[PDB]
RNA sequence: CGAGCUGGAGAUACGCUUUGACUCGGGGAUGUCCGAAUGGGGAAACCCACCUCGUAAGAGGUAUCCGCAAGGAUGGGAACUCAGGGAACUGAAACAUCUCAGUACCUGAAGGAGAAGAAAGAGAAUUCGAUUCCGUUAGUAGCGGCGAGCGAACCCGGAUCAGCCCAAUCAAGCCGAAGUGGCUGGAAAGCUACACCUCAGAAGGUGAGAGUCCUGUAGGCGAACGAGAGGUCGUUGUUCGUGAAACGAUGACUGAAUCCGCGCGGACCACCGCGCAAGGCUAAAUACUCCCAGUGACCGAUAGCGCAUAGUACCGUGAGGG
RNA sequence: UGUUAUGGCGUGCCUAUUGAAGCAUGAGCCGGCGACUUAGACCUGACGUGCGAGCUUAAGUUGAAAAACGGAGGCGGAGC
RNA sequence: GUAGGGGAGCGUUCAGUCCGCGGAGAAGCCAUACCGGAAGGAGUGGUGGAGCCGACUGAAGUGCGGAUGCCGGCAUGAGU
C-alpha cells in the first residue's frame, strides 16, 4: 500500500522499524516543556517483522 | 548410468499432504476455511494511526565508486567513460560519483562526472587530475 | 585423451570437467530438459463453471436429507473437478553455465569407457547401410550395446538406420540425455568437439 | 467398429487365382478363389470345409440337415504360388495389353 | 436525432456538500452520482423535395446563414 | 482405380458389371413445401389470387428500401473485433464515493480478422518519428472518504515495417527392398538354427508379441484440370475522484485568425522548443475457433463432451432443464 | 487353524465440548465417486546446486527425433 | 499426549531407463497358519484369458467411515 512509502518505516542497513513520536504534535497541544520538541526516533523488537512486509521489496 | 544417477541427497524435500494422519484436522480449529482475505497489512493495526508525510522526490541518484577500485589493483587503464564499464561499474541512465574510502597512496587520473570534495583532495594529493563535464 | 581412429590423431585437447563426473550434475540436467519436453495437456473440467448443469436445485431447509445447490460441484458424481489438472508450461531456464558444464560432464563420463570417434567416413559410400555395419565389426560396435552418432554430413545419416546398433544426430545437436542414453558414443567429426 | 480399414481396404488377390492357407489350419493346403469381400477382408476358398447346419422353421418342408459350406478367412492366406509355396508377389510388366499390369516374384509365370 | 452528426447520448451529475468558503474549505463531499441524459428541438426543413426532418438549434443557427448541403 | 457391386442392416428375391460397376476427387443438370420468405393471408411447412407464355400438363413473374441502368441490401454465424446502452451481489470485516467494472447482459454493424493509422504527437535529447502487438521500464511517477485499492507513459529490445490520393506445393492415386525348415500350441508374427533387406526399425491388421504375410512408411511418379478552434455551464476519458487541474470529447448558449499565423509543451505569462486540425483510404506483425491433421509423464466409460451418440427418452404451458 | 463351553475383564464411532456409552450431532448396508490445488521473471525463509565481487536474461530469431543465439533489463556494489 | 511444529518411510497412476516375465498362460479376483518396526510385501493353490512385476528417477485428478455427502445396487420394516 503507497501509504507505508511516506510512513516512519523507512528501510535502514539492519532492516528495521524508522519510527517518531505520535505522541502529540499538531492539533490539542499547548501543555508540558520539551514534550513537543521530542521529535527524535523510534525503534520496536515486536512489529518490525509484521511491518517491513509492506515495504521491504521497495526499499 | 541414467539408472545408478541419484539425487542431491538434500536437494528436494517430499511435499507436505493434508489427507489422512490419523489425527489432522488442518487450519485451525475454527475461523479459517476457505476464505483467504484475513492479510496482515490493514489500516488500524500497527500501520496508520501514525503521524507522518514529509514529501516524495527522488531526483538523481549517483553511482559510488569505492576508491579501493581506481586504486590499490588495477593498473590505470584510464577511466574516461567507456573503459571504465569494465571495471564493474556498468549502471548507465545516471552519472558517476567519486567517493573516498581506500587509503593509499598511487598517481591515478580520474575522470567521472562528480566527484565528493575529500576524493579530489585525496586523488591529487598522491599525483592526478579529476576532470567533471563542463 | 581419445585417440582419433580414422584419419588424424590427437586426443589430448580438452579439458575434462572436475571431479570424475558428477551424477547429481547430471541429474540436474536431464531432469530440466526432459521438463522442457513435457507437454501442456489436462482435460479436466476442474471448474464446476465448465460443465453442464443449473445454478438451483432443492429447498435448502424443508424437504429433508438434502443441502445442495447445483448439481456440478466435485461432490457430484457426474460434476467438476476439485483441483483438477489444468494445461500448464513447467519450461524454466537452466542456467547457462550449467548446460555448458553438463555435456562437457556427460562427454567426460563416456571418455572412461566407451569412447570412439573418427575423422571422414569414406568408408560408407553411399546409402547400402550393409557396408556401414561391416563396418561397425571393425570398430568393436558388434551392435550389442546402443550407441549415438553425432556427426554432419547427410550421407552418412542416410545410412544409419536401426534400434540396438547406433542413432543419428543431426548437426551436432549433443544432449546429456542422449549421450548418457546409449552405451558407446561416436562423436566423429570435430566441428563442435576441439 | 473399424474392421478391415486396418488395410486400405484393397485385395491382393482376385476371385480365381489359386492360394494356399499360410498358419492357422489346412497348413500348405491349397484350393480356387470363390469369394472375395475387400471390406471384410473376407476370402472363400474350397479348403477350409466346415460342415454347417441350416435352421430352416417353416420353410416348405424343413427337414433339417448337416449341409456342406465353405469358411471366410482373412489375410491368413498367400495370393497366388508357384514354386509351390507362398511369394511377394509385386514386378509388374506387360505382354500385349499395355492397359494392364501384371505380378512375378522372382519367376514371372503368375 | 438532428441532421449533422449524431446528437442526445448524455453523462452523469454530481452534487456536493460545503459549497465555497474562507478560500479553499475542507474538501468536497461527492454525493449524487446519478446518471441523465440530453434531448433537443425540431423544425419543419426540405432538401431538394418536400421534407420536415430534424433541426438542431446549432445546426439552425448554422444553417439560416450559410446552407452547407441544404436549405431553409 | 481394376472386380467387384447390390447404403447404417444381421435377411430374402430380382439384378447392374471389360461397351470398366462400385468407390475416391472435380464441374454441371434436376431441387416439391417451409423458412430473410419476398403474390396475398397465415396459429411455418397451409389456404386463396391475378397477369403472361400456352398442346392441356406446366413454367415464369408479382415484397420493401437506395438508382437512368447494372447492381446491391434487409438473413444466418461458436468465439474473436468495434459501437450505442449499461448492473448488482462483492470489497471497504457496516455503508453513501471508489472498487466490483465499462464485468455480465442487451442491441447495432462487419470480416476471415477487426480496431487503429501517415502527427496541430510523444518528449526534454535542440531527439525519435504511421498504427498495433510482445518484452521491459514497474508496479516506478501518479490517483484515492490519501481508506479499501486502483495504476500509466517516454527511452531501449523484438514481431512486422508502404504511404499514396482530395478541397481552394497442398486433395485423388500409382510405384515401392528383404524367410524357410524344425519345435511347444487350438492357432504363432513366439523359441530355435540359418539368411536377407535396410534413401524403408513410424504404425495398424493378420487365430499370440509382428523388418522381410498384408496395408503401408523412405523415395520416386502424379491428369482432364480444381485451388493458392476557443470560452462559459453541465460532465467525462487517460494514473487523474475538483484538486494548483491542463488537454481531449460532448449536450446547450456564443463564436477567431491565417504569415512579423494558429495549437501544444500538467492554472497562467515571457522566453524557448515541438507541431500545422476542422477531408478520406490503406497489407503485415495481433485475436478467436465451428471445421480439418498431427501430437500428449490427457481420460479409458461413477472417467472423458451431456451423449462410446441423444439434446434422445423423460419433466415443464413455456423460456428451459435433461 | 476352526469352533465352542466357562471364568476374569470390559460405557459403540465420529463430531462438538469444561466435561460423551451418552437419553447431544451424523449415519440402513456395500461399492464406486468425493476435499489444502494451480498461476503470477511476485514477496520472504530453509535446503541443494552452478558461478562468484559479480551473478542472470525477457520478448524474439534460427533451428526441433537435439538446442543455441538473444544483455533492452532486474538483483550486488553507500549511506543519510 | 489434543491443537501445532519437525523427521524418516509405505502405497497408487502416469513417464524415462534398465533387468525381464507371459499360451506349459499376465493383470484382476478368491483362499491361506509366512516375512517386515508401521504403512505393507511374498510364496503356494484356485479362477481367469491377455498383458504386466522389480530397481532407479521425474510428475500428480495419489490413499476415505463419516460431510441429514453424490451415483448405483441390495437389505429392515413382512409376507405386514
Ligand atoms: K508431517
Ligand atoms: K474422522
Ligand atoms: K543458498
Ligand atoms: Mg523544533
Ligand atoms: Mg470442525
Ligand atoms: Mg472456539
Ligand atoms: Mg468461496
Ligand atoms: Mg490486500
Ligand atoms: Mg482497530
Ligand atoms: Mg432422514
Ligand atoms: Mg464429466
Ligand atoms: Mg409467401
Ligand atoms: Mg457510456
Ligand atoms: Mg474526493
Ligand atoms: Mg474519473
Ligand atoms: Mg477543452
Ligand atoms: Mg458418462
Ligand atoms: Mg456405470
Ligand atoms: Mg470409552
Ligand atoms: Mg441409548
Ligand atoms: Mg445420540
Ligand atoms: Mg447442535
Ligand atoms: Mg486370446
Ligand atoms: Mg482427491
Ligand atoms: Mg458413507
Ligand atoms: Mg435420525
Ligand atoms: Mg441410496
Ligand atoms: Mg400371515
Ligand atoms: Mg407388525
Ligand atoms: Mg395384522
Ligand atoms: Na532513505
Ligand atoms: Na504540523
Ligand atoms: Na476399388
Ligand atoms: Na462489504
Ligand atoms: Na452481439
Ligand atoms: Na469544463
Ligand atoms: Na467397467
Ligand atoms: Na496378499
Known sequence: THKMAKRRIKITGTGKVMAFKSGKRHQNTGKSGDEIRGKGKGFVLAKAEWARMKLMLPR | GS???????????????????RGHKGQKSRSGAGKGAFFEGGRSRLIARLPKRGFNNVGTTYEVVKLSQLQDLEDTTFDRDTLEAYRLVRRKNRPVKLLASGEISRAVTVHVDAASAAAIKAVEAAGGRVVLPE | AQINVIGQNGGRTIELPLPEVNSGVLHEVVTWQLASRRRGTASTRTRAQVSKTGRKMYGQKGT???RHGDRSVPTFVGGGVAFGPKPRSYDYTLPRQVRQLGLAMAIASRQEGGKLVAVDGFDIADAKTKNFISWAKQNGLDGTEKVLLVTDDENTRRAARNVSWVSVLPVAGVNVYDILRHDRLVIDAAALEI | ???????????????????????????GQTGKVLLALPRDQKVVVEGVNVITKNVKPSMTNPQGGQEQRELALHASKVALVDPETGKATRVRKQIVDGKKVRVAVASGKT | TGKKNLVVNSVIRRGKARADGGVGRKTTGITKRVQRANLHKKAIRENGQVKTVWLSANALRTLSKGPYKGIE
Open chain 4, 1 to 27: 467398429p473399424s474392421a478391415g480399414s486396418h488395410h486400405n481396404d484393397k485385395l491382393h488377390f482376385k476371385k480365381g487365382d489359386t492360394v494356399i492357407v499360410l498358419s492357422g489350419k489346412h497348413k
Open chain 2, 3 to 21: 539408472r545408478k544417477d541419484r539425487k542431491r541427497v538434500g536437494r528436494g524435500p517430499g511435499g507436505t499432504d493434508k489427507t489422512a494422519g
Open chain 3, 64 to 66: 429433508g436429507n438434502a
